[PDB]
Ligand binder design. Structure first.
Ligand SMILES: CCCCCCCCCCCCO[C@@H]1O[C@H](CO)[C@@H](O[C@H]2O[C@H](CO)[C@H](O)[C@H](O)[C@H]2O)[C@@H](O)[C@H]1O
Lengths: 1042, 161, 107, 107, 268
């Protein structure tokens, strides 16, 4: 401690070494958008090509709800048995548990359910995957000069992209937007009716005829003696073109004109799927969706992926140009520069105050030298802690500048002044300053560490967010304090100039501002003034009660948040066509949207990405999606050119002048969050009921909670509503007569109207699928039920109109689950001005009052936020209790910490007051701001009160006079610091451009908080201190202690 | 068949249990098919019962099998999913469609078991459906609706008939 | 359960169930002959119970025009049972079992 | 010596009689396609082979934890899993963490 | 696989099977001109053997009443073999194999002695549908990083040390086709790794004891005065290592770090 005062170079070594500890800790330090914030979930999906809702729920889903029993860290099971054949189970897990543990546990509990799958699934896999929706990227692929169409792009995408670009240094998961090539065989039921042939004979044709086969070997082992040759048998070989498949034989007629597949059906090298359509500005495109890598940098995934795409880009076909409709990278690149930028400004402004007060080049430089050693060395504190330098944490740094310089600054002042009051040599007066103010610095260390720690031990996403500042500003804190035991004190004695007793500077320079007198003159006004109030206490007690009270009322009338909203340079508008509509009407909507953006907002939009076929709730021709990217932030000025107004006028444009519900919107800051005032009610069927009853419950309840405009809000379903289905009940009697085979009827119905994955072939050197679906026009109109004939056992065909009754019933096309049992997703919300949980109480009261097998339970957003709920008061009571007891400790009593605790309201009342005026919100950034304010307030009170009690004690002076002296001499520093702060934090406060929701949010609460805190505390604290101490001890008295 | 693998103390439990199931699938395809179709459960477990909750019927007018069904209908889906449970032995049995073959009345009508099997297999299933206005349709098309097919059964009626 | 054991006698050469049964018996009587070292030397488990071979003369069935496969699967679904399909009770899946009736498989 | 070599999981299977480019571009590089996102990978070695044995050796960074490796990677293969053969899938398939160094061979 | 390395020759471009093979025999033949650096330069992989194509013509048999499945399977189980079920040997499960005998499966004509039973009851020779030729094929195709590669295996010539042969390898891999590159894996991979460290460990560790010295035991000049001693330590470790017959490996590196170590102690 004192010891390093007389080892200045040893100190230096610590300084240059730690600064380097910094630079080295910076160059290879990770950067992300935010820290990994969201609870990890793993999802299981399977593909049952052509099934209906009840089917993928009842063949794949339910036998699963029974065999993956027993994975640990159980939490909840949300599922969709899509009526497209996809079954999707998202297990969303408890925060921060290790994912991969879950992932393997599950993949090895499905292989328990595996033979208990249907065989078309069983052959087409089931996938278990750790999952988010956080696409780092969606990279488009297009051809400019209409050279290829969606399936060509898609095919190349699957054959020339996904193995070598995703070798680039920085990559996690890959997802292809489009369809891989598959050998597409389109059966004509006429040309199949002709030769009495049905799908089954076709199936059996391509299956038996198309493969590799068990060869054998000449000289096979074990051969027999004398042998002098060993060689391999080749055989029947899998096919290769569209050519080799038309030449395939199905049956030879007695006349000799053989019938090949080329005849009965049509042949094209086609797509494995024609569900979703991908349009880049209307032009054909197919796309890719990329997730970041396991601790990887976003910007280097960007440098290497974009370099890689540029490495195959001439080695791409003609017209084939890669596109970037969706990146979350420049937002982050620019986020970083804007935050450094503000910090740079903060540095310079702090230094400005620092000069225009200390005015001595070498003395004004010492605390400026103070800063790099401190940050750079803090980066070293981060590089070793396993976290990342993102916007938020480095924000903790820019925020930390105040609790950094504060210490060092105080010391340079205390020394300069003592050197004006005792005349001693640099080093000695310095020594006294360091030995008397040890308590100032170790005290601040004790309490700031005391206030930023309690937040790190908070839960949830917001809690981890807190973890980041805790560590940055505490490391920053402790190191600034500790530099204050090694660095700052030696820098204090040594690089600082010696002063004789009473130098004062008063108007002792003319061109450089006489200024100093004014300060000094003014502090006389200040000082006489504190005395004046000290004489008359009661008044100040009362007015305090005012500030307290105001602080309270005002706290209430300040509305919460979870995080601020962000113009990300990228937003999206989604489309929704009424039940059962087709792909066509949706596609009308997508290009019409594309018109709106490229026209009535032509200047703002750069590229639209139109997606037809799966949108929000699920997959389904009637559903659409649009990615709207903008021109770089430099060219979007006003209120009207930023995401806000754009979304407003977009959805404005579409709501009242269409037949379809189509909405435009802006994405959250955090790439997955609590939907704030609200929930996602899971309505669970527990009793032996069925889908009709839950839905009727949806009617009942959507009617039961929407009837309270005073508590509940947005009673809406998320999903697709109840669609028209076409039951074709086959009467088996009739076919058990006619000599037709059921397998023949079924598999023909299937392979005709759904289709069948039959075999595999080898296109261009890569294995792909072989599909035989009927053609368009022979299975698109109800009437086409007819054109299909079954070849009996005897030998003549039968119409479906010979055995098939045909009707329209009802079903929902997206079958939801919550833990293996029948469930329903009611998204919902509390009134904009009601807490969400109150809405939980009234909604639970309605959904309680529903039929037995219609229950209530919680999922997603309202789950974790229900268990980890009633705790925020407890931890901030702790941040406070740590403040009261820790400073009661560094000193040595009780009454003496109370007087410093009286300051927090002077601090709070300022964060509310300034923020309320702007329009900000008691969210996180205002919370971290709030804590920091507490810190500031107690700091300053530490300054003054410390000096007064010290004198009272160890030099025995009188209270009032000691408070006045302290108050007098400590005015100057308090002010130096505080000005450094307000001015350092300022730029954040008024800056627009990336995350300014963030900058502004930190800044405003922090600034106004600091102002009222000081400009009121420097008048209250001495009266806090005086009256506080005046109710403890008896004799003394007003102490003279010699 | 019950194969209990006891691991070195303090080892990673779950890593072990999962390792086991992805070594179940090296030997799994070449297994019997009556088994493969009747599942095998691999579950990390004590060497004894931790707890037993009983259920009985007040008026007694339920049979072991009835109560047992109820258990299976409203609770025992997550008891093996609590982040600490291996196998639960259910005291009872969940319901199954029980067809009790009469061997005289089967010799009567020229049919044997084999015929009963292939019968019920074929007559009882879901079926590969399709979609009206299937994708990819042609212009003007204004319909997409769900093709339902034959559905697996539901009552005692459907199984007698 | 205090001072004791769970002794495993493992067959290693491959002498099948019988030789093991007898070696274990030899042993179990051999330990009952030392009350000055052991207590309750008991085997834990079940012995060898009466089982009833229905040996099929494949030939007589190979002329006769019956197919063995069916004959097996019949004996089976008769006295053991068969898992055939799945159905939907009250909205929840269960199994499909066809076993013989009571009185037609007990003696 | 210490755990010196970078960690690899090897997959081997039998497709009796297949050719070099099938088992190279059907069985081998059919997995290495969803192997995007591996923790601490160093290099990748692979075999097609013309006797029906197919080998995909995925090799990662020293101490990147094996049991852990087979975790993320057997589950990154079990994602690349659909483009391999099913005749491969039916006859004995091994995913086993591997060196290539016989620690010992006893005769 | 041997003394120091396992040189991996990697395909990066879009050239070809044939052409690459020609580029590498080009290198393995181009290096035989160096007895003062290399010894036992050998190639890794299986090259390309004679294959025996048997095309079965489906039509001709699709009449004759023979079923394809039956012909496939028989061809197989004849010259490949089949796993059917399992049996119980001596108290242990084992497999069951049904393959032909030896002498009917070593020469092509034995195809003849093989007949497939049609639907009617008469057999058919393979010479009724099977054309047969001699073409070529590859067995086992090597890759490094998923792409076509060849390990030019080697050891250094008996003339001492292992790494000079590796540096000479780096000189061989220059005069070959546009798209043909070099990398090291295994023994020499690490020799890439523990080699090009020379700038970094010495960029850093040298600066660290400098500050360590200006530290607890103070001053400016003291670390300079002591630090001029580092060459004095090495030039003997270098002098000796050359004189004997050694090479700048790891053991010489620890040899060095240590030596500069005691030396810096002394001047300290
Ligand atoms: C913007 C609205 C709210 C902001 C104002 C908050 C308070 C800060 C202003 C302080 C300056 C005015 O303060 C007023 O003048 C002086 C110095 O304080 C004192 O006045 C004093 O004069 C004499 C001096 O002996 C009396 O004996 C007694 O000590 C007291 O009356 C105070 O009692 C106060 O009434």
């Amino acid at each position: 401690p004192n010891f390093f005062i007389d080892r200045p170079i040893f100190a230096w070594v610590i300084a240059i070494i730690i600064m380097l500890a910094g630079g080295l800790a910076i160059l290879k330090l990770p950067v992300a958008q935010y820290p990994t914030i969201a609870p990890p979930a793993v999802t299981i999906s399977a593909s049952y090509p052509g099934a209906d809702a009840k089917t993928v729920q009842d063949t794949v889903t339910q036998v699963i709800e029974q065999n993956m029993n027993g994975i640990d860290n159980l939490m909840y099971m949300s599922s969709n048995s899509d009526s497209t054949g996809t079954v999707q189970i998202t297990l969303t897990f408890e925060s921060g548990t290790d994912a991969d543990i879950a992932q393997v546990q599950v993949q090895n509990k499905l292989q328990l359910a595996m033979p208990l799958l249907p065989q078309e699934v069983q052959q087409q896999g089931v996938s278990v995957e750790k999952s988010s929706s956080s696409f780092l990227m969606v990279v488009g692929v297009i051809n400019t000069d209409g050279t290829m169409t969606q399936e060509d792009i898609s095919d190349y995408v699957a054959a020339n992209m996904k193995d070598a670009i995703s070798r680039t240094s920085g990559v996690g998961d890959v997802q292809l937007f489009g369809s891989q090539y598959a050998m597409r065989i389109w059966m004509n039921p006429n040309e199949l009716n002709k030769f009495q042939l049905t799908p089954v004979d076709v199936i059996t044709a391509i299956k038996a005829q198309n493969a590799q086969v068990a060869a054998g070997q000449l000289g096979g082992t074990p051969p027999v003696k004398g042998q002098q040759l060993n060689a391999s048998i080749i055989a029947q070989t899998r096919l290769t073109s569209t050519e080799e498949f038309g030449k395939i034989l199905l049956k030879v007629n007695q006349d000799g004109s053989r019938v090949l597949l080329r005849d009965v059906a049509k042949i094209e090298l086609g797509g494995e799927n024609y569900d979703i359509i991908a349009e880049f500005n209307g032009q054909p495109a197919s796309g890719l969706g990329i997730k970041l890598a396991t601790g990887a940098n976003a910007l280097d995934t960007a440098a290497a992926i974009r370099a890689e795409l540029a490495k195959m880009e001439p080695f791409f076909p003609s017209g084939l140009k890669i596109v970037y409709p969706y990146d979350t990278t420049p937002f982050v690149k620019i986020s970083i520069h804007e935050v450094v930028k503000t910090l740079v400004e903060a540095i310079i402004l702090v230094f400005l105050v620092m000069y225009l007060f200390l005015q001595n080049f070498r003395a004004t430089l010492i605390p400026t030298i103070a800063v790099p050693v401190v940050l750079l060395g803090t980066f070293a504190v981060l590089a070793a802690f396993g976290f990342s330098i993102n916007t938020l944490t480095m924000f903790g740094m820019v925020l930390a500048i105040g609790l950094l310089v504060d210490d060092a600054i105080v010391v340079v002042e205390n020394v300069e002044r003592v050197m004006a009051e005792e005349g001693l040599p640099p080093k000695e007066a310095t020594r006294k300053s360091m030995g008397q103010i040890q308590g100032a610095l170790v005290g601040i260390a004790m309490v700031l560490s005391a206030v930023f720690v309690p937040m790190a031990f908070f839960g949830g996403s917001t809690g981890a967010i807190y973890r980041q500042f805790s560590i940055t500003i505490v490391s920053a804190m402790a190191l600034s304090v500790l530099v204050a035991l090694i660095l700052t004190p030696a820098l204090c004695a040594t690089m600082l100039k010696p002063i004789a007793k009473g130098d004062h500077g008063e108007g002792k320079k003319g061109f450089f501002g006489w200024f100093n007198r004014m300060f000094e003159k003014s502090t006389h006004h200040y000082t006489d003034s504190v005395g004046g109030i000290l004489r008359s206490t009661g008044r100040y007690l009362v007015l305090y009660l005012i500030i307290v009270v105001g602080m309270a009322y005002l706290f209430v009338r300040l509305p919460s948040s979870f995080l601020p909203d962000e113009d990300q340079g990228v937003f999206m508008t989604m489309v929704q066509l009424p039940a059962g509509a087709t792909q066509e009407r949706t596609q009308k909507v997508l290009n019409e949207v594309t018109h709106y953006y490229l026209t009535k907002e032509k200047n703002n939009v750069e590229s639209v990405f139109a997606v037809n076929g799966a949108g929000a709730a699920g997959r389904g021709q009637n559903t659409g999606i649009a990615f709207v990217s903008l021109k770089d932030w430099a060219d979007r000025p006003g209120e009207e050119n930023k995401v806000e107004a754009i979304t407003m006028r977009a959805t404005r444009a579409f709501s009242q002048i269409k037949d379809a519900m189509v909405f435009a919107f802006n994405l959250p800051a955090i790439v997955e969050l609590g939907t704030a005032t609200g929930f996602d009610f899971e309505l669970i069927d527990q009793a032996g009921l069925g889908h009709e009853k839950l839905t009727q419950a949806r009617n009942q309840l959507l009617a039961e909670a929407a009837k309270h405009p005073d508590m509940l809000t947005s009673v809406r379903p998320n999903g697709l509503e109840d669609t028209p289905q076409f039951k074709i009940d086959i009467d088996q009697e009739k076919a058990q007569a006619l000599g037709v085979s059921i397998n023949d009827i079924n598999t023909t119905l299937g392979a005709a109207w759904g289709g069948s994955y039959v075999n595999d072939f080898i296109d261009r050197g890569r294995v792909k699928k072989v599909y035989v679906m009927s053609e368009a026009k022979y299975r698109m109109l109800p009437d086409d039920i007819g054109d299909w004939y079954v070849r009996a056992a005897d030998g003549q065909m039968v119409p479906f109109s010979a055995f098939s009754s045909s009707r329209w019933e009802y079903g929902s096309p997206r079958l939801e689950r919550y833990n293996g049992l029948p469930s329903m997703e009611i998204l919902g919300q509390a009134a904009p001005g009601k807490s969400t949980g109150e809405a939980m109480e009234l909604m639970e009261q309605l959904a309680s009052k529903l039929p037995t097998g219609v229950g209530y339970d919680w999922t997603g957003m309202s789950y974790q936020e229900r268990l980890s709920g009633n705790q925020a008061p407890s931890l901030y009571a702790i941040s406070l209790i740590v403040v009261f007891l820790c400073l009661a400790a560094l000193y040595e009593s009780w009454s003496i910490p109370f007087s410093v605790m009286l300051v927090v309201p002077l601090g709070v009342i300022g964060a509310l007051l300034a923020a309320t005026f702007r329009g900000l919100t008691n969210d996180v950034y205002f919370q971290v701001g709030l804590l920091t304010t507490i810190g500031l307030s107690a700091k300053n009170a530490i300054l003054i009160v410390e000096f007064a009690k010290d004198l009272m004690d160890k030099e025995g002076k009188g209270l009032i006079e000691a408070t006045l002296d302290a108050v007098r001499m400590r005015l100057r520093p308090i002010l130096m610091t505080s000005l450094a702060f307000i001015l350092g934090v300022m730029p954040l406060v008024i800056s627009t451009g990336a995350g300014s929701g963030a900058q502004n949010a930190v800044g405003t609460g922090v600034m106004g908080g600091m102002v009222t805190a000081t400009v009121l505390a420097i008048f209250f604290v001495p009266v806090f201190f005086v009256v506080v101490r005046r109710r403890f001890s008896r004799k003394n008295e007003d102490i003279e202690h010699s």
